[PDB]
Each structure stands twice: as structure tokens, then as C-alpha cells.
Amino acid sequence: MDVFMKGLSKAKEGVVAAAEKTKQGVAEAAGKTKEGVLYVGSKTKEGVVHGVATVAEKTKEQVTNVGGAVVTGVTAVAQKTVEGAGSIAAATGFVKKDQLGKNEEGAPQEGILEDMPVDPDNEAYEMPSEEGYQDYEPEA
């Protein structure tokens, strides 16, 4: 289940496949170097030039067959890129979250004035309006 183990067992499959091939390449190379020390009036320089010249003709039939393969492969990667874009959309689109409205206070004072006209000397004229009750000793 660990997506990591798979990627690991997948690489080992390539290292082994490459070994069988790399191990088969040195095998032929060994016998090839064996003829190197031995001269061969048959393989002359002019003969080598004609060899690479012939392999250049087949290389055309190969790139032609694979030429249609690389085109199809790139097409698969093309649709594989647009899909990866979805992941980018998430990185930019942060996981939305509906629950808060951020409203500390829209400065709901009560009027344009500082709303502090109240006088500390006596609130207003003289305490509540009442009916005088008592404030002057003499009749007036």
C-alpha cells in the first residue's frame, strides 16, 4: 500500500533488466577485443567507411518506425500535463472555510458627534428636572 514501496520495487526491476543487458554487452565486447589485437586484411579502412555508410541507410527505416512512436508518446504526456494542473488549482485555491464573518464592530457609535456632550459638573442644568424640591433656602 505504501506508494513508496511500489516506486522502490519498480526501480529494482530496471536495475536488473539493465544488468542482463550490460552483462550481455561486455560479453560480445570481450570476444570483439580478441579480434582487435589480431589484424584482418579483410576489414580495411575503406571497408569500415562502407560499413557506417550502410548502417546510415537502415537508421532511416528505424527512426521512421519509431518516429510515429515518439509522437504518440508525447501525446500521452500532453494529456498528463493538463491533468497535473488540477493540483496547481488546489495550491492556489486554499481550502475554502465557511464559518466566520470577521465582524469585530462596524464602529456602531450613535451619532456624528463624539457622543460625549454630557457635562460632569451636574449631568445637565441641575440633576433630573424634578420640581426643585429643595435647592434654595429662601423662598426664591
mmCIF file of N, CA, C and O in Angstrom, residues 40-103:
data_model
loop_
_atom_site.group_PDB
_atom_site.id
_atom_site.type_symbol
_atom_site.label_atom_id
_atom_site.label_comp_id
_atom_site.label_asym_id
_atom_site.label_seq_id
_atom_site.Cartn_x
_atom_site.Cartn_y
_atom_site.Cartn_z
ATOM 1 N N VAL A 40 43.323 -7.958 -39.564
ATOM 2 C CA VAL A 40 42.402 -8.651 -40.512
ATOM 3 C C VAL A 40 42.451 -7.936 -41.865
ATOM 4 O O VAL A 40 41.689 -7.026 -42.127
ATOM 5 N N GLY A 41 43.348 -8.339 -42.725
ATOM 6 C CA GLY A 41 43.457 -7.683 -44.061
ATOM 7 C C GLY A 41 42.075 -7.576 -44.710
ATOM 8 O O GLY A 41 41.906 -6.920 -45.718
ATOM 9 N N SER A 42 41.084 -8.213 -44.148
ATOM 10 C CA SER A 42 39.719 -8.141 -44.744
ATOM 11 C C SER A 42 39.044 -6.831 -44.326
ATOM 12 O O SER A 42 38.476 -6.130 -45.136
ATOM 13 N N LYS A 43 39.102 -6.494 -43.064
ATOM 14 C CA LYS A 43 38.461 -5.228 -42.595
ATOM 15 C C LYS A 43 39.436 -4.061 -42.782
ATOM 16 O O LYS A 43 40.131 -3.669 -41.866
ATOM 17 N N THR A 44 39.488 -3.502 -43.962
ATOM 18 C CA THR A 44 40.414 -2.357 -44.215
ATOM 19 C C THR A 44 39.683 -1.040 -43.940
ATOM 20 O O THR A 44 38.474 -1.004 -43.820
ATOM 21 N N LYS A 45 40.408 0.040 -43.833
ATOM 22 C CA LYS A 45 39.754 1.352 -43.564
ATOM 23 C C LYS A 45 38.605 1.562 -44.554
ATOM 24 O O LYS A 45 37.470 1.770 -44.168
ATOM 25 N N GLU A 46 38.888 1.510 -45.826
ATOM 26 C CA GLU A 46 37.813 1.709 -46.838
ATOM 27 C C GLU A 46 36.626 0.800 -46.510
ATOM 28 O O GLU A 46 35.486 1.149 -46.737
ATOM 29 N N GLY A 47 36.886 -0.362 -45.974
ATOM 30 C CA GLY A 47 35.771 -1.289 -45.632
ATOM 31 C C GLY A 47 34.963 -0.706 -44.471
ATOM 32 O O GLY A 47 33.749 -0.799 -44.437
ATOM 33 N N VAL A 48 35.623 -0.103 -43.522
ATOM 34 C CA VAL A 48 34.894 0.485 -42.364
ATOM 35 C C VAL A 48 34.020 1.644 -42.850
ATOM 36 O O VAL A 48 32.864 1.755 -42.493
ATOM 37 N N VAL A 49 34.562 2.507 -43.664
ATOM 38 C CA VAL A 49 33.762 3.656 -44.172
ATOM 39 C C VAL A 49 32.498 3.132 -44.857
ATOM 40 O O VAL A 49 31.430 3.700 -44.733
ATOM 41 N N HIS A 50 32.609 2.052 -45.582
ATOM 42 C CA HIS A 50 31.415 1.492 -46.275
ATOM 43 C C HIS A 50 30.456 0.901 -45.240
ATOM 44 O O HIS A 50 29.261 0.840 -45.448
ATOM 45 N N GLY A 51 30.969 0.467 -44.121
ATOM 46 C CA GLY A 51 30.085 -0.117 -43.074
ATOM 47 C C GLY A 51 29.192 0.978 -42.489
ATOM 48 O O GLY A 51 27.982 0.914 -42.570
ATOM 49 N N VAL A 52 29.781 1.984 -41.904
ATOM 50 C CA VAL A 52 28.966 3.084 -41.316
ATOM 51 C C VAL A 52 28.051 3.669 -42.394
ATOM 52 O O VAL A 52 26.973 4.148 -42.113
ATOM 53 N N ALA A 53 28.475 3.636 -43.628
ATOM 54 C CA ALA A 53 27.630 4.191 -44.722
ATOM 55 C C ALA A 53 26.391 3.312 -44.904
ATOM 56 O O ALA A 53 25.315 3.791 -45.202
ATOM 57 N N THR A 54 26.533 2.026 -44.725
ATOM 58 C CA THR A 54 25.363 1.117 -44.888
ATOM 59 C C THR A 54 24.448 1.241 -43.668
ATOM 60 O O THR A 54 23.242 1.269 -43.786
ATOM 61 N N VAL A 55 25.015 1.315 -42.495
ATOM 62 C CA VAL A 55 24.176 1.436 -41.268
ATOM 63 C C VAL A 55 23.394 2.750 -41.312
ATOM 64 O O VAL A 55 22.377 2.901 -40.662
ATOM 65 N N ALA A 56 23.859 3.705 -42.069
ATOM 66 C CA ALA A 56 23.141 5.008 -42.153
ATOM 67 C C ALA A 56 21.850 4.829 -42.951
ATOM 68 O O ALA A 56 20.905 5.580 -42.803
ATOM 69 N N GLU A 57 21.797 3.837 -43.799
ATOM 70 C CA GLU A 57 20.564 3.611 -44.605
ATOM 71 C C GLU A 57 19.500 2.949 -43.730
ATOM 72 O O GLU A 57 18.334 3.279 -43.796
ATOM 73 N N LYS A 58 19.892 2.018 -42.904
ATOM 74 C CA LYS A 58 18.902 1.337 -42.023
ATOM 75 C C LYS A 58 18.415 2.318 -40.954
ATOM 76 O O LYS A 58 17.249 2.349 -40.609
ATOM 77 N N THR A 59 19.300 3.122 -40.428
ATOM 78 C CA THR A 59 18.889 4.101 -39.384
ATOM 79 C C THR A 59 17.662 4.878 -39.867
ATOM 80 O O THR A 59 16.867 5.348 -39.081
ATOM 81 N N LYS A 60 17.508 5.018 -41.156
ATOM 82 C CA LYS A 60 16.334 5.765 -41.688
ATOM 83 C C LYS A 60 15.068 4.926 -41.503
ATOM 84 O O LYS A 60 14.021 5.436 -41.165
ATOM 85 N N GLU A 61 15.156 3.643 -41.725
ATOM 86 C CA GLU A 61 13.956 2.774 -41.562
ATOM 87 C C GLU A 61 13.610 2.651 -40.077
ATOM 88 O O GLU A 61 12.485 2.355 -39.711
ATOM 89 N N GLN A 62 14.564 2.876 -39.214
ATOM 90 C CA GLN A 62 14.288 2.771 -37.754
ATOM 91 C C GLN A 62 13.597 4.048 -37.270
ATOM 92 O O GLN A 62 12.486 4.017 -36.783
ATOM 93 N N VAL A 63 14.249 5.171 -37.398
ATOM 94 C CA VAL A 63 13.630 6.448 -36.944
ATOM 95 C C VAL A 63 12.228 6.579 -37.544
ATOM 96 O O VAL A 63 11.335 7.146 -36.943
ATOM 97 N N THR A 64 12.026 6.063 -38.725
ATOM 98 C CA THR A 64 10.682 6.161 -39.360
ATOM 99 C C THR A 64 9.674 5.342 -38.551
ATOM 100 O O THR A 64 8.591 5.799 -38.243
ATOM 101 N N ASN A 65 10.020 4.132 -38.205
ATOM 102 C CA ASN A 65 9.080 3.287 -37.416
ATOM 103 C C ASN A 65 8.889 3.895 -36.025
ATOM 104 O O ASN A 65 7.785 4.019 -35.536
ATOM 105 N N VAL A 66 9.960 4.277 -35.382
ATOM 106 C CA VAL A 66 9.839 4.877 -34.023
ATOM 107 C C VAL A 66 9.337 6.317 -34.144
ATOM 108 O O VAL A 66 8.691 6.836 -33.257
ATOM 109 N N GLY A 67 9.622 6.965 -35.241
ATOM 110 C CA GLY A 67 9.161 8.370 -35.419
ATOM 111 C C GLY A 67 7.673 8.469 -35.082
ATOM 112 O O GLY A 67 7.219 9.443 -34.523
ATOM 113 N N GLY A 68 6.910 7.463 -35.415
ATOM 114 C CA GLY A 68 5.451 7.501 -35.113
ATOM 115 C C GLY A 68 5.224 7.139 -33.644
ATOM 116 O O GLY A 68 4.168 7.379 -33.092
ATOM 117 N N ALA A 69 6.205 6.561 -33.005
ATOM 118 C CA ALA A 69 6.043 6.183 -31.573
ATOM 119 C C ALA A 69 6.291 7.406 -30.688
ATOM 120 O O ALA A 69 5.518 7.706 -29.798
ATOM 121 N N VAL A 70 7.363 8.116 -30.921
ATOM 122 C CA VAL A 70 7.654 9.317 -30.089
ATOM 123 C C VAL A 70 6.491 10.307 -30.195
ATOM 124 O O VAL A 70 6.150 10.979 -29.242
ATOM 125 N N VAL A 71 5.880 10.405 -31.344
ATOM 126 C CA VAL A 71 4.739 11.351 -31.500
ATOM 127 C C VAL A 71 3.578 10.888 -30.616
ATOM 128 O O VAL A 71 2.961 11.673 -29.922
ATOM 129 N N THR A 72 3.278 9.618 -30.634
ATOM 130 C CA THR A 72 2.159 9.106 -29.794
ATOM 131 C C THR A 72 2.529 9.251 -28.316
ATOM 132 O O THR A 72 1.708 9.600 -27.492
ATOM 133 N N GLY A 73 3.761 8.992 -27.974
ATOM 134 C CA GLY A 73 4.182 9.117 -26.551
ATOM 135 C C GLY A 73 3.988 10.560 -26.085
ATOM 136 O O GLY A 73 3.326 10.821 -25.099
ATOM 137 N N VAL A 74 4.553 11.502 -26.791
ATOM 138 C CA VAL A 74 4.398 12.929 -26.387
ATOM 139 C C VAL A 74 2.914 13.239 -26.185
ATOM 140 O O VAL A 74 2.538 13.962 -25.284
ATOM 141 N N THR A 75 2.067 12.696 -27.016
ATOM 142 C CA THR A 75 0.608 12.960 -26.869
ATOM 143 C C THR A 75 0.146 12.494 -25.487
ATOM 144 O O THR A 75 -0.634 13.151 -24.825
ATOM 145 N N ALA A 76 0.623 11.363 -25.043
ATOM 146 C CA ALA A 76 0.214 10.856 -23.703
ATOM 147 C C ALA A 76 0.708 11.821 -22.624
ATOM 148 O O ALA A 76 0.014 12.114 -21.674
ATOM 149 N N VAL A 77 1.906 12.318 -22.765
ATOM 150 C CA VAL A 77 2.445 13.266 -21.751
ATOM 151 C C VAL A 77 1.668 14.580 -21.823
ATOM 152 O O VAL A 77 1.479 15.261 -20.831
ATOM 153 N N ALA A 78 1.211 14.944 -22.990
ATOM 154 C CA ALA A 78 0.446 16.214 -23.131
ATOM 155 C C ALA A 78 -0.812 16.153 -22.261
ATOM 156 O O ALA A 78 -1.089 17.050 -21.490
ATOM 157 N N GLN A 79 -1.576 15.103 -22.381
ATOM 158 C CA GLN A 79 -2.814 14.985 -21.560
ATOM 159 C C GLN A 79 -2.432 14.728 -20.102
ATOM 160 O O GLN A 79 -3.224 14.898 -19.202
ATOM 161 N N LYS A 80 -1.217 14.312 -19.865
ATOM 162 C CA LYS A 80 -0.775 14.042 -18.468
ATOM 163 C C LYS A 80 -0.372 15.363 -17.805
ATOM 164 O O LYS A 80 -0.349 15.480 -16.596
ATOM 165 N N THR A 81 -0.056 16.357 -18.590
ATOM 166 C CA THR A 81 0.347 17.670 -18.010
ATOM 167 C C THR A 81 -0.901 18.464 -17.617
ATOM 168 O O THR A 81 -1.020 18.942 -16.506
ATOM 169 N N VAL A 82 -1.833 18.611 -18.520
ATOM 170 C CA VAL A 82 -3.069 19.378 -18.195
ATOM 171 C C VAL A 82 -3.694 18.820 -16.915
ATOM 172 O O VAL A 82 -4.195 19.553 -16.089
ATOM 173 N N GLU A 83 -3.664 17.527 -16.741
ATOM 174 C CA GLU A 83 -4.258 16.928 -15.512
ATOM 175 C C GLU A 83 -3.491 17.426 -14.286
ATOM 176 O O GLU A 83 -4.073 17.803 -13.287
ATOM 177 N N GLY A 84 -2.188 17.438 -14.355
ATOM 178 C CA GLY A 84 -1.385 17.915 -13.193
ATOM 179 C C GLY A 84 -1.812 19.338 -12.831
ATOM 180 O O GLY A 84 -1.667 19.772 -11.706
ATOM 181 N N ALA A 85 -2.337 20.069 -13.777
ATOM 182 C CA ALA A 85 -2.773 21.463 -13.487
ATOM 183 C C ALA A 85 -3.800 21.446 -12.352
ATOM 184 O O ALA A 85 -3.841 22.337 -11.528
ATOM 185 N N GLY A 86 -4.627 20.438 -12.303
ATOM 186 C CA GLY A 86 -5.648 20.364 -11.220
ATOM 187 C C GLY A 86 -4.964 20.542 -9.864
ATOM 188 O O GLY A 86 -5.443 21.258 -9.005
ATOM 189 N N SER A 87 -3.846 19.899 -9.665
ATOM 190 C CA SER A 87 -3.130 20.034 -8.366
ATOM 191 C C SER A 87 -2.762 21.500 -8.139
ATOM 192 O O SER A 87 -2.883 22.020 -7.047
ATOM 193 N N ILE A 88 -2.314 22.174 -9.164
ATOM 194 C CA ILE A 88 -1.942 23.607 -9.005
ATOM 195 C C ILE A 88 -3.171 24.406 -8.571
ATOM 196 O O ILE A 88 -3.098 25.256 -7.708
ATOM 197 N N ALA A 89 -4.305 24.135 -9.159
ATOM 198 C CA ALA A 89 -5.539 24.878 -8.775
ATOM 199 C C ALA A 89 -5.737 24.783 -7.261
ATOM 200 O O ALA A 89 -6.101 25.742 -6.612
ATOM 201 N N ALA A 90 -5.499 23.633 -6.694
ATOM 202 C CA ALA A 90 -5.671 23.477 -5.222
ATOM 203 C C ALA A 90 -4.651 24.356 -4.497
ATOM 204 O O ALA A 90 -4.976 25.065 -3.563
ATOM 205 N N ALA A 91 -3.416 24.317 -4.918
ATOM 206 C CA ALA A 91 -2.377 25.153 -4.254
ATOM 207 C C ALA A 91 -2.830 26.613 -4.242
ATOM 208 O O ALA A 91 -2.679 27.312 -3.260
ATOM 209 N N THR A 92 -3.378 27.082 -5.330
ATOM 210 C CA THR A 92 -3.839 28.498 -5.380
ATOM 211 C C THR A 92 -5.169 28.625 -4.637
ATOM 212 O O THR A 92 -5.355 29.505 -3.819
ATOM 213 N N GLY A 93 -6.099 27.752 -4.913
ATOM 214 C CA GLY A 93 -7.416 27.823 -4.221
ATOM 215 C C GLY A 93 -7.295 27.207 -2.828
ATOM 216 O O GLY A 93 -7.439 26.015 -2.650
ATOM 217 N N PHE A 94 -7.036 28.012 -1.835
ATOM 218 C CA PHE A 94 -6.909 27.472 -0.454
ATOM 219 C C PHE A 94 -8.220 26.792 -0.054
ATOM 220 O O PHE A 94 -9.291 27.211 -0.444
ATOM 221 N N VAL A 95 -8.147 25.745 0.721
ATOM 222 C CA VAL A 95 -9.393 25.043 1.140
ATOM 223 C C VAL A 95 -10.371 26.061 1.737
ATOM 224 O O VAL A 95 -10.235 26.476 2.870
ATOM 225 N N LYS A 96 -11.355 26.469 0.979
ATOM 226 C CA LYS A 96 -12.341 27.462 1.499
ATOM 227 C C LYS A 96 -12.799 27.045 2.901
ATOM 228 O O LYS A 96 -12.611 25.921 3.316
ATOM 229 N N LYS A 97 -13.391 27.947 3.636
ATOM 230 C CA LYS A 97 -13.855 27.606 5.011
ATOM 231 C C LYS A 97 -14.996 28.545 5.415
ATOM 232 O O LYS A 97 -14.778 29.692 5.756
ATOM 233 N N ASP A 98 -16.214 28.074 5.361
ATOM 234 C CA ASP A 98 -17.378 28.943 5.725
ATOM 235 C C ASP A 98 -17.759 28.721 7.190
ATOM 236 O O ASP A 98 -18.211 27.660 7.570
ATOM 237 N N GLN A 99 -17.588 29.720 8.015
ATOM 238 C CA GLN A 99 -17.948 29.567 9.455
ATOM 239 C C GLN A 99 -17.752 30.908 10.176
ATOM 240 O O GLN A 99 -18.434 31.209 11.136
ATOM 241 N N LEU A 100 -16.819 31.707 9.716
ATOM 242 C CA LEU A 100 -16.550 33.033 10.361
ATOM 243 C C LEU A 100 -16.956 34.161 9.412
ATOM 244 O O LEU A 100 -17.045 33.979 8.213
ATOM 245 N N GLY A 101 -17.200 35.332 9.949
ATOM 246 C CA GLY A 101 -17.598 36.504 9.106
ATOM 247 C C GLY A 101 -16.720 37.704 9.473
ATOM 248 O O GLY A 101 -16.823 38.764 8.887
ATOM 249 N N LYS A 102 -15.858 37.541 10.439
ATOM 250 C CA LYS A 102 -14.968 38.660 10.854
ATOM 251 C C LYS A 102 -15.798 39.934 11.039
ATOM 252 O O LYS A 102 -15.985 40.704 10.118
ATOM 253 N N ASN A 103 -16.298 40.163 12.224
ATOM 254 C CA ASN A 103 -17.115 41.386 12.478
ATOM 255 C C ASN A 103 -16.842 41.889 13.894
ATOM 256 O O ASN A 103 -17.651 41.736 14.786
#
